[PDB]
Amino acid sequence: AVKKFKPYTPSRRFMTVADFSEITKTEPEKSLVKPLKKTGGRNNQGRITVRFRGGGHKRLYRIIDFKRWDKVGIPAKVAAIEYDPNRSARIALLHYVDGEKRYIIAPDGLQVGQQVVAGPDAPIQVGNALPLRFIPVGTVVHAVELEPKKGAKLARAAGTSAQIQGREGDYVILRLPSGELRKVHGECYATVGAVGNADHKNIVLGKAGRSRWLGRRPHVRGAAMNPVDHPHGGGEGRAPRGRPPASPWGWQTKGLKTRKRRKPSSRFIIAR
Amino acid sequence: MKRTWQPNRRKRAKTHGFRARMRTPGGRKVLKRRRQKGRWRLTPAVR
RNA sequence: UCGAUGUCGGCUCGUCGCAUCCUGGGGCUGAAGAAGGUCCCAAGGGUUGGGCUGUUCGCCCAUUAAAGCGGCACGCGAGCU
RNA sequence: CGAAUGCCGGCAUGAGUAACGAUAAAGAGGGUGAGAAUCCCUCUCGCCGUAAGCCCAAGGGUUCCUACGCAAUGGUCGUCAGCGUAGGGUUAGGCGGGACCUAAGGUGAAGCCGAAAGGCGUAGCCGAAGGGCAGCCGGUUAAUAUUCCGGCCCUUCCCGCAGGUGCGAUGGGGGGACGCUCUAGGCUAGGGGGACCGGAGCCAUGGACGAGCCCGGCCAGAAGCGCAGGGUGGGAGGUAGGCAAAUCCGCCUCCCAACAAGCUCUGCGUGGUGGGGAAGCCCGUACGGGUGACAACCCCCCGAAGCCAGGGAGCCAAGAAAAGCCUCUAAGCACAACCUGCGGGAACCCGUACCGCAAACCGACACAGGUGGGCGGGUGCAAGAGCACUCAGGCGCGCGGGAGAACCCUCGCCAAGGAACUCUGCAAGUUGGCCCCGUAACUUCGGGAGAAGGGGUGCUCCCUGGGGUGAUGAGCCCCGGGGAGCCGCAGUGAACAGGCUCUGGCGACUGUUUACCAAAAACACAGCUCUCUGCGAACUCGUAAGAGGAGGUAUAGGGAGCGACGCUUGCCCGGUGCCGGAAGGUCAAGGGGAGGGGUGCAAGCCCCGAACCGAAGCCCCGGUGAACGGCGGCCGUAACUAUAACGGUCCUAAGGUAGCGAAAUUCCUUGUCGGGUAAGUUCCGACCUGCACGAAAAGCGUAACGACCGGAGCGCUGUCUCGGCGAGGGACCCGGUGAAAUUGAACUGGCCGUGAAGAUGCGGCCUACCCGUGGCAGGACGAAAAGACCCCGUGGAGCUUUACUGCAGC
RNA sequence: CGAGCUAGCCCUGGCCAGGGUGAAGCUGGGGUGAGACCCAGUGGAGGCCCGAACCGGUGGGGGAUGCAAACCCCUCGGAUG
RNA sequence: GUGGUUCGUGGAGCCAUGGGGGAAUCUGGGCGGACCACCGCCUAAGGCUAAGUACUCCGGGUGACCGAUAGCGCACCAGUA
RNA sequence: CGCGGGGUGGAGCAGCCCGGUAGCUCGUCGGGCUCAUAACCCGAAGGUCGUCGGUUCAAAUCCGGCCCCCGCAACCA
RNA sequence: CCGAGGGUAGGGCCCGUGACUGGGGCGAAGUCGUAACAAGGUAGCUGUACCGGAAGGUGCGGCUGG
RNA sequence: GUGGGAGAGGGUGGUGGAAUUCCCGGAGUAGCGGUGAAAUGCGCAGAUACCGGGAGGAACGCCGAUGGCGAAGGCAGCCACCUGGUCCACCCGUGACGCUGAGGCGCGAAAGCGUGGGGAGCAAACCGGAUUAGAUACCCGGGUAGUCCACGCCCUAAACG
Ligand SMILES: [Mg+2]
Ligand SMILES: [Mg+2]
Ligand SMILES: [Mg+2]
Ligand SMILES: [Mg+2]
Ligand SMILES: [Mg+2]
Ligand SMILES: [Mg+2]
Ligand SMILES: [Mg+2]
Ligand SMILES: [Mg+2]
Ligand SMILES: [Mg+2]
Ligand SMILES: [Mg+2]
Ligand SMILES: [Mg+2]
Ligand SMILES: [Mg+2]
Ligand SMILES: [Mg+2]
Ligand SMILES: [Mg+2]
Ligand SMILES: [Mg+2]
Ligand SMILES: [Mg+2]
Ligand SMILES: [Mg+2]
Ligand SMILES: [Mg+2]
Ligand SMILES: [Mg+2]
Ligand SMILES: [Mg+2]
Ligand SMILES: [Mg+2]
Ligand SMILES: [Mg+2]
Ligand SMILES: [Mg+2]
Ligand SMILES: [Mg+2]
Ligand SMILES: [Mg+2]
Ligand SMILES: [Mg+2]
Ligand SMILES: [Mg+2]
Ligand SMILES: [Mg+2]
Ligand SMILES: [Mg+2]
Ligand SMILES: [Mg+2]
Ligand SMILES: [Mg+2]
Ligand SMILES: [Mg+2]
Ligand SMILES: [Mg+2]
Ligand SMILES: [Mg+2]
Ligand SMILES: [Mg+2]
Ligand SMILES: [Mg+2]
Ligand SMILES: [Mg+2]
Ligand SMILES: [Mg+2]
Ligand SMILES: [Mg+2]
Ligand SMILES: [Mg+2]
Ligand SMILES: [Mg+2]
Ligand SMILES: [Mg+2]
Ligand SMILES: [Mg+2]
Ligand SMILES: [Mg+2]
Ligand SMILES: [Mg+2]
Ligand SMILES: [Mg+2]
Ligand SMILES: [Mg+2]
Ligand SMILES: [Mg+2]
Ligand SMILES: [Mg+2]
Ligand SMILES: [Mg+2]
Ligand SMILES: [Mg+2]
Ligand SMILES: [Mg+2]
Ligand SMILES: [Mg+2]
Ligand SMILES: [Mg+2]
Ligand SMILES: [Mg+2]
Ligand SMILES: [Mg+2]
Ligand SMILES: [Mg+2]
Ligand SMILES: [Mg+2]
Ligand SMILES: [Mg+2]
Ligand SMILES: [Mg+2]
Ligand SMILES: [Mg+2]
Ligand SMILES: [Mg+2]
Ligand SMILES: [Mg+2]
Ligand SMILES: [Mg+2]
Ligand SMILES: [Mg+2]
Ligand SMILES: [Mg+2]
Ligand SMILES: [Mg+2]
Ligand SMILES: [Mg+2]
Ligand SMILES: [Mg+2]
Ligand SMILES: [Mg+2]
Ligand SMILES: [Mg+2]
Ligand SMILES: [Mg+2]
Ligand SMILES: [Mg+2]
Ligand SMILES: [Mg+2]
Ligand SMILES: [Mg+2]
Ligand SMILES: [Mg+2]
Ligand SMILES: [Mg+2]
Ligand SMILES: [Mg+2]
Ligand SMILES: [Mg+2]
Ligand SMILES: [Mg+2]
Ligand SMILES: [Mg+2]
Ligand SMILES: [Mg+2]
Ligand SMILES: [Mg+2]
Ligand SMILES: [Mg+2]
Ligand SMILES: [Mg+2]
Ligand SMILES: [Mg+2]
Ligand SMILES: [Mg+2]
Ligand SMILES: [Mg+2]
Ligand SMILES: [Mg+2]
Ligand SMILES: [Mg+2]
Ligand SMILES: [Mg+2]
Ligand SMILES: [Mg+2]
Ligand SMILES: [Mg+2]
Ligand SMILES: [Mg+2]
Ligand SMILES: [Mg+2]
Ligand SMILES: [Mg+2]
Ligand SMILES: [Mg+2]
Ligand SMILES: [Mg+2]
Ligand SMILES: [Mg+2]
Ligand SMILES: [Mg+2]
Ligand SMILES: [Mg+2]
Ligand SMILES: [Mg+2]
Ligand SMILES: [Mg+2]
Ligand SMILES: [Mg+2]
Ligand SMILES: [Mg+2]
Ligand SMILES: [Mg+2]
Ligand SMILES: [Mg+2]
Ligand SMILES: [Mg+2]
Ligand SMILES: [Mg+2]
Ligand SMILES: [Mg+2]
Ligand SMILES: [Mg+2]
Ligand SMILES: [Mg+2]
Ligand SMILES: [Mg+2]
Ligand SMILES: [Mg+2]
Ligand SMILES: [Mg+2]
Ligand SMILES: [Mg+2]
Ligand SMILES: [Mg+2]
Ligand SMILES: [Mg+2]
Ligand SMILES: [Mg+2]
Ligand SMILES: [Mg+2]
Ligand SMILES: [Mg+2]
Ligand SMILES: [Mg+2]
Ligand SMILES: [Mg+2]
Ligand SMILES: [Mg+2]
Ligand SMILES: [Mg+2]
Ligand SMILES: [Mg+2]
Ligand SMILES: [Mg+2]
Ligand SMILES: [Mg+2]
Ligand SMILES: [Mg+2]
Ligand SMILES: [Mg+2]
Ligand SMILES: [Mg+2]
Ligand SMILES: [Mg+2]
Ligand SMILES: [Mg+2]
Ligand SMILES: [Mg+2]
Ligand SMILES: [Mg+2]
Ligand SMILES: [Mg+2]
Ligand SMILES: [Mg+2]
Ligand SMILES: [Mg+2]
Ligand SMILES: [Mg+2]
Ligand SMILES: [Mg+2]
Ligand SMILES: [Mg+2]
Ligand SMILES: [Mg+2]
Ligand SMILES: [Mg+2]
Ligand SMILES: [Mg+2]
Ligand SMILES: [Mg+2]
Ligand SMILES: [Mg+2]
Ligand SMILES: [Mg+2]
Ligand SMILES: [Mg+2]
Ligand SMILES: [Mg+2]
Ligand SMILES: [Mg+2]
Ligand SMILES: [Mg+2]
Ligand SMILES: [Mg+2]
Ligand SMILES: [Mg+2]
Ligand SMILES: [Mg+2]
Ligand SMILES: [Mg+2]
Ligand SMILES: [Mg+2]
Ligand SMILES: [Mg+2]
Ligand SMILES: [Mg+2]
Ligand SMILES: [Mg+2]
Ligand SMILES: [Mg+2]
Ligand SMILES: [Mg+2]
Ligand SMILES: [Mg+2]
Ligand SMILES: [Mg+2]
Ligand SMILES: [Mg+2]
Ligand SMILES: [Mg+2]
Ligand SMILES: [Mg+2]
Ligand SMILES: [Mg+2]
Ligand SMILES: [Mg+2]
Ligand SMILES: [Mg+2]
Ligand SMILES: [Mg+2]
Ligand SMILES: [Mg+2]
Ligand SMILES: [Mg+2]
Ligand SMILES: [Mg+2]
Ligand SMILES: [Mg+2]
Ligand SMILES: [Mg+2]
Ligand SMILES: [Mg+2]
Ligand SMILES: [Mg+2]
Ligand SMILES: [Mg+2]
Ligand SMILES: [Mg+2]
Ligand SMILES: [Mg+2]
Ligand SMILES: [Mg+2]
Ligand SMILES: [Mg+2]
Ligand SMILES: [Mg+2]
Ligand SMILES: [Mg+2]
Ligand SMILES: [Mg+2]
Ligand SMILES: [Mg+2]
Ligand SMILES: [Mg+2]
Ligand SMILES: [Mg+2]
Ligand SMILES: [Mg+2]
Ligand SMILES: [Mg+2]
Ligand SMILES: [Mg+2]
Ligand SMILES: [Mg+2]
Ligand SMILES: [Mg+2]
Ligand SMILES: [Mg+2]
Ligand SMILES: [Mg+2]
Ligand SMILES: [Mg+2]
Ligand SMILES: [Mg+2]
Ligand SMILES: [Mg+2]
Ligand SMILES: [Mg+2]
């Protein structure tokens, strides 16, 4: 894991690349890819609604499967492990015996060669997807639906996971990858395991350009603008924030809690 | 050094031409205006 | 003088004043000699090269007969910087 | 009308002045003509040649070719022209685009939203310098040609014949179909040599009849074939997936091939045939043509970045779509239909001139500027698209003639000295290519490093190793190795081609920036921290629908600071902000009606109204520092003196820790000392009295990097002592063309006074014949700009906030 | 009414002579209990080096009713990101 | 909660209506400037309606209207160059 | 020279504002505990409020001058 | 040819010296406290770590030389 | 060699309960903590004590001993795997094949370091209440690194018999 470099240039010193030994196949499943329209941060009016985006290598989108109850009870053999340029994680190729192939988001410690199944049945194992109600408690799980039939949403990023800490009535208690404590519905499919590529968090971009390749462009500080531009613009040399610190648009950026309070969602949440 | 006029035969009609003045009510009035002043040309001519 | 009289310093080119730095001529001396002091006359000419600082000024190095003080929009940017 | 830096027009002055637009450069003969430096032809000279040559795309739109013209346009001239008039000129089933596909985006039946105008939007549709598609060599015109002609190839549609098969689609499946760097084999383009082939000719001026000299030695081409290469397994069984179905595709199993073996596709070769085909001489062309010729038509070498091509390897940042194409089946229809081959017929619209790094495009100009793709020969220097010369081809820049002043510009050289110049070595010099030796502190071990400093460099003869091509051999091409000699001041002999070291500051670094006075110590940067955000996320845009975020999910996304890395980042929560707090306080509409009132005969209608219940906010409670921020005063004390480890007391929310310190911060100030210098307000080292450093508006260091900013040496210099001479382009004289700001009028002198206080204009005096040229800048408070500084105006605008008052948002 | 200048982004194409340095990995040899590692070859990475095209605009002179309403000469920065 | 009216919250009615409530059909309902009695006026919650009125692209008539810097911007091949 | 704050027993601070009536800690002197010192305990002393002027009955206190200390400012030029 | 040496360039070691600075030694009777020696009045010492005018204080672990 | 034994020897993966702390819930009231005595702290916004649920980390009570094990450092709930050293019986094999050991190599308590993760209790530093002349200590209330885990460094010690 985590390939380093001799410093035969600066920026090649502290730089770091992932280890692709996991990656078993170097071109994707033409059947399962579709093209990715790159936004540039712009929305349906040619307006930038997210700052500092664009540039960066073109990507092909892998259409990946987050509902696993299409295929209930069918198994599949894990065919390949691939690079997915659109996510932290890696994707698994898996041929269902159905003859139907899909991509899956690859759990940690999932060999090529595994059979894998999805359903209320099904053994408690890496790759396997069940409703939450049949996962035994204290099981480490990932790629969880929030509400039934709606698709995996939680714990999908490289190294992420969730624990099933309990059950109460129709619902079950999870610790999220953020340590929030959430009730989720019995009938939500979650595939067991953590996600892995867990070493993802140690990569060191190492040089400016490598940040461009991921399509994020320079971020210039409020501090360095003029008043027209930012709450922190101005002041002759440097100068400190001179007010409670703020976003360009003017709301306070240290401590302000933005979660809408009257969300009904909130009955189902117990933590930080 | 590179100047303000970089003539391109398509942009012009694409931009200021007649079919384009007519989709925007803004431009329909451009025409209304021009036509009533008796412009010989309501639109730049092309090619 | 604001329907504009470009500001410090330098360089260039100077000209003028004398309340004289030096050279010429003087009185007095607490002037033996040499060399000084101090005041008078005298504007003819002369009045160095460098280290530092934008500096003018100043301080300093090495000299000198001496290494003068001023005015000319603090001389001079339709002459330069 | 006399004034408004008035308005519109006319004409002056400046003035025969400055200019005539690249310093690539001209000269002469002859022709035409009213007229010739300027037009045509010849000759000689110079200039481009990874162009200043040639071909495409934009844009331009008759500029194209011919005849007749010269008033205007042409920076002069014009007999010429891109100018006037007139006439001619653009030929396509295969080139480009359309009766083909889709991309961003646009549009938009369904749908959704919005006072109206309108906004969104799945499908479809439109949209190309991308995907798909069938033409190559030559000849002809004054002017068009892959367009016409000639030779040889090819596509699609319609109809028919023959043979074959369940045919059949907008549907299913395959394919189209892909990045970056490096790169194998074999070709081609292109190029060099040849003693061989072909060829007009030539022997000068001392020599040469020669294996002399000069010229040239190919192009295109179906099938078939041959050489390199691309693509692709075959059979069956099962079959629940590919929104119907499928024999297809997917998946499992079994059996064969493992390789291109077979099938297939493309490149190149050869190819029936077809075509070109020099120098030179002659002819007369404005420019082409006669013969050369019956031309020759071949070996060798170099060799792509191009081709086989979807080739191969590696890497992470992970690399379009749809149709054409093939296959599969559904309706349907199967005397259909489709597949194959052959034959006949049918084949539309638009562009095609010319310019195209520019005198035809964008820059008011025949403007030293800008403008995308391709080709871009030869020799030499290591390479090369570099530099020098040079071919084809194209040019001498649309004012000239002379003179040989000051001064200017751009160059060249310089006795002795060598930074003394100066804000500063600014400028300029020195250095310089390659081969070899050799190379420090320090370091993140890569670097530092072209460190530094040195040696070599040509020519000639002899000996000689390996490589690619050839057979292993000659020849040819490439890399060398040793020996002896020759010549000059000098051998990278001209041209292109780093000056170097020591040492601070700031910034880690390559990058970004004020188009057009700032390129930087500023921005950005990987990286650290805080903080928000459970996903119909936060946040942004939008009245909204919708969209971005993201077809992402906390190893994610947003916001803020800090800014590689090393070592670190102390103390204060009183105020402010944010976070938590069921209580208490206070509080809006609302609820509540005690009680009061108007009016009526009255039942009534109407109005007012205290307690009490009643959000958020604020108050109160607490937390919070990589949140806004803040981090003391006086007095004494040690056995010389000084100072004060110690103490006292007043205050605070707490009293500045480390480290650093006269600093990009130090006022006093050129502090004091030390170092460098003959001399140092700068610079380096240190002290601490820090006016007024101090820890993520980070503190102190740091190798490497810097067109950043200081200081110092070496080297070398016209920077200087201090100037000189020389070159060209101007300046000057002559011929041609001929502006400009400015301008109350002018017959426009000095001094000393006076004057609104700085007089050619008033006083007194002095000087002074009229008018010019080339020169200098002291003066006309010279020109320019209705002063930007400063003040005024109850003038304006950008910006801020615990100014006022509102609105969005929450 | 304007993004035919200019700033960003999206889609699709194209361009970067020539030299230099020599990372990983691979292979071999040494090492060892096995390793680490060491050496050598090969290999060919990099906001690496020098330098044309191309993109810039460092300093200086010229220009200043200009060739030019931002140009010219010399010098200089990047040049596989 | 607003708008209209002379009415700017004012004793603020009338006319209109975004929100909450929410009737009756002659003895039913609105109005005369908060509200109450009295006395009057008038019959909302559907529609149509010439003329008298505004303007002048066009035609005509007339000017103590202009006469080519005037009069339309255009007397002329002008919304042109 | 400007604005604002101060000057009180020996040292450091209250009191001044709102006139009468000067307090707090330490130090000092006397006693005590101790072998003795410090600590510790008990007692005590000590002042004209910078100064000169005025106001009042009366002034540290209200007012003005002068002298001082602390702080702030000294901009466009 | 070689050549004493001379000159130019760049390294290594050793000596001396240097504003200032670090600690150390020593010095009849200075200042501050009381760490250790008697449960030295918190058992002592100990490696390390953070702090603190100063001896030293505390954390973790160890030693008994209680 | 054969057979045979004891053991907290080491490495890995699991797992149990006791207590602490936070949380939810119930009841229930005016104090609880703390000390030499206290104060800071906590509590009517419902604390302490009590009960039921849950989360999480660390350490393993009686057995346990003046015991065992290891070369040293060191090693203690329980279970399984892999695994080192060591002793005994029998006298079966080989025939001096030994001892030590400069360098070298490796292990090496705690505390410290790096990059992640984990953080209940404890706790340098720090803040506060006390004590003192003072108290940057000793006592008390708070409390961050750290203690734990993985990987990688550090190489020290009254590392002592
Ligand atoms: Mg739009
Ligand atoms: Mg970022
Ligand atoms: Mg930034
Ligand atoms: Mg700024
Ligand atoms: Mg703006
Ligand atoms: Mg603002
Ligand atoms: Mg600010
Ligand atoms: Mg500014
Ligand atoms: Mg500042
Ligand atoms: Mg700023
Ligand atoms: Mg959160
Ligand atoms: Mg224009
Ligand atoms: Mg076009
Ligand atoms: Mg017309
Ligand atoms: Mg003035
Ligand atoms: Mg004037
Ligand atoms: Mg003037
Ligand atoms: Mg005199
Ligand atoms: Mg004399
Ligand atoms: Mg004399
Ligand atoms: Mg004498
Ligand atoms: Mg004189
Ligand atoms: Mg004189
Ligand atoms: Mg000097
Ligand atoms: Mg100087
Ligand atoms: Mg001075
Ligand atoms: Mg002098
Ligand atoms: Mg002057
Ligand atoms: Mg000037
Ligand atoms: Mg003047
Ligand atoms: Mg003339
Ligand atoms: Mg003149
Ligand atoms: Mg002249
Ligand atoms: Mg002239
Ligand atoms: Mg004739
Ligand atoms: Mg060439
Ligand atoms: Mg065209
Ligand atoms: Mg034109
Ligand atoms: Mg014409
Ligand atoms: Mg012509
Ligand atoms: Mg003419
Ligand atoms: Mg013509
Ligand atoms: Mg044809
Ligand atoms: Mg048709
Ligand atoms: Mg089309
Ligand atoms: Mg289409
Ligand atoms: Mg519709
Ligand atoms: Mg639309
Ligand atoms: Mg769309
Ligand atoms: Mg196309
Ligand atoms: Mg195409
Ligand atoms: Mg075609
Ligand atoms: Mg032609
Ligand atoms: Mg042709
Ligand atoms: Mg033809
Ligand atoms: Mg059938
Ligand atoms: Mg079929
Ligand atoms: Mg078909
Ligand atoms: Mg050929
Ligand atoms: Mg040849
Ligand atoms: Mg011959
Ligand atoms: Mg012949
Ligand atoms: Mg001869
Ligand atoms: Mg012959
Ligand atoms: Mg098969
Ligand atoms: Mg079958
Ligand atoms: Mg089916
Ligand atoms: Mg062939
Ligand atoms: Mg390939
Ligand atoms: Mg289609
Ligand atoms: Mg049928
Ligand atoms: Mg043509
Ligand atoms: Mg043509
Ligand atoms: Mg050009
Ligand atoms: Mg070109
Ligand atoms: Mg040309
Ligand atoms: Mg031309
Ligand atoms: Mg010209
Ligand atoms: Mg031009
Ligand atoms: Mg170009
Ligand atoms: Mg060439
Ligand atoms: Mg060559
Ligand atoms: Mg060369
Ligand atoms: Mg060239
Ligand atoms: Mg030629
Ligand atoms: Mg010329
Ligand atoms: Mg010319
Ligand atoms: Mg000389
Ligand atoms: Mg000389
Ligand atoms: Mg010298
Ligand atoms: Mg000097
Ligand atoms: Mg000087
Ligand atoms: Mg220079
Ligand atoms: Mg040079
Ligand atoms: Mg090196
Ligand atoms: Mg080295
Ligand atoms: Mg060298
Ligand atoms: Mg030689
Ligand atoms: Mg020679
Ligand atoms: Mg020689
Ligand atoms: Mg030269
Ligand atoms: Mg050179
Ligand atoms: Mg060089
Ligand atoms: Mg400095
Ligand atoms: Mg930088
Ligand atoms: Mg910037
Ligand atoms: Mg600029
Ligand atoms: Mg500007
Ligand atoms: Mg600049
Ligand atoms: Mg720069
Ligand atoms: Mg909004
Ligand atoms: Mg969305
Ligand atoms: Mg998306
Ligand atoms: Mg974040
Ligand atoms: Mg910053
Ligand atoms: Mg801090
Ligand atoms: Mg502190
Ligand atoms: Mg605070
Ligand atoms: Mg607080
Ligand atoms: Mg607070
Ligand atoms: Mg709150
Ligand atoms: Mg309350
Ligand atoms: Mg109320
Ligand atoms: Mg009420
Ligand atoms: Mg409230
Ligand atoms: Mg508080
Ligand atoms: Mg300090
Ligand atoms: Mg220091
Ligand atoms: Mg200092
Ligand atoms: Mg100094
Ligand atoms: Mg300072
Ligand atoms: Mg000295
Ligand atoms: Mg000195
Ligand atoms: Mg000194
Ligand atoms: Mg300076
Ligand atoms: Mg210094
Ligand atoms: Mg600072
Ligand atoms: Mg600060
Ligand atoms: Mg700060
Ligand atoms: Mg900084
Ligand atoms: Mg620093
Ligand atoms: Mg540095
Ligand atoms: Mg740079
Ligand atoms: Mg720079
Ligand atoms: Mg000179
Ligand atoms: Mg000269
Ligand atoms: Mg000359
Ligand atoms: Mg006068
Ligand atoms: Mg007169
Ligand atoms: Mg008079
Ligand atoms: Mg006069
Ligand atoms: Mg004259
Ligand atoms: Mg003058
Ligand atoms: Mg002049
Ligand atoms: Mg004015
Ligand atoms: Mg105003
Ligand atoms: Mg407000
Ligand atoms: Mg653009
Ligand atoms: Mg290697
Ligand atoms: Mg090996
Ligand atoms: Mg590079
Ligand atoms: Mg090119
Ligand atoms: Mg450009
Ligand atoms: Mg730029
Ligand atoms: Mg420049
Ligand atoms: Mg210049
Ligand atoms: Mg000039
Ligand atoms: Mg560079
Ligand atoms: Mg370069
Ligand atoms: Mg790119
Ligand atoms: Mg109203
Ligand atoms: Mg109203
Ligand atoms: Mg209503
Ligand atoms: Mg009424
Ligand atoms: Mg009434
Ligand atoms: Mg009525
Ligand atoms: Mg009319
Ligand atoms: Mg008339
Ligand atoms: Mg007229
Ligand atoms: Mg008119
Ligand atoms: Mg007239
Ligand atoms: Mg007019
Ligand atoms: Mg008429
Ligand atoms: Mg007309
Ligand atoms: Mg006493
Ligand atoms: Mg020697
Ligand atoms: Mg102790
Ligand atoms: Mg003691
Ligand atoms: Mg003790
Ligand atoms: Mg402590
Ligand atoms: Mg300790
Ligand atoms: Mg035996
Ligand atoms: Mg035996
Ligand atoms: Mg250890
Ligand atoms: Mg430890
Ligand atoms: Mg530390
Ligand atoms: Mg740690
Ligand atoms: Mg404690
Ligand atoms: Mg505690």
Numbering used by the authors:
A (entry chain 11): 2 to 273
B (entry chain P8): 1 to 47
The authors write:
Here we present several high-resolution structures of Thermus thermophilus 70S ribosomes programmed by templates carrying missense errors. The collection of our structures puts forward a decoding mechanism that, for the first time, sets the molecular basis behind the phenomenon of translational infidelity and is in good agreement with in vivo studies of the missense errors that occur during protein synthesis. Our models suggest an advanced mechanism of decoding that, for the first time, describes how a missense error can skip discrimination, leading to translational infidelity. Our data provide evidence that steric complementarity and shape acceptance but not the number of hydrogen bonds between the decoding centre and a codon–anticodon duplex play the discriminatory role during decoding.
We also solved a control structure to demonstrate that the decoding centre is specific in our system and can only bind cognate tRNA or near-cognate tRNA that resembles cognate substrates. In this control complex, where mRNA programmed the ribosome with the AAA codon in the A-site and where tRNAPhe with the GAG anticodon was given as a substrate, no binding of tRNAPhe to the A-site was detected.
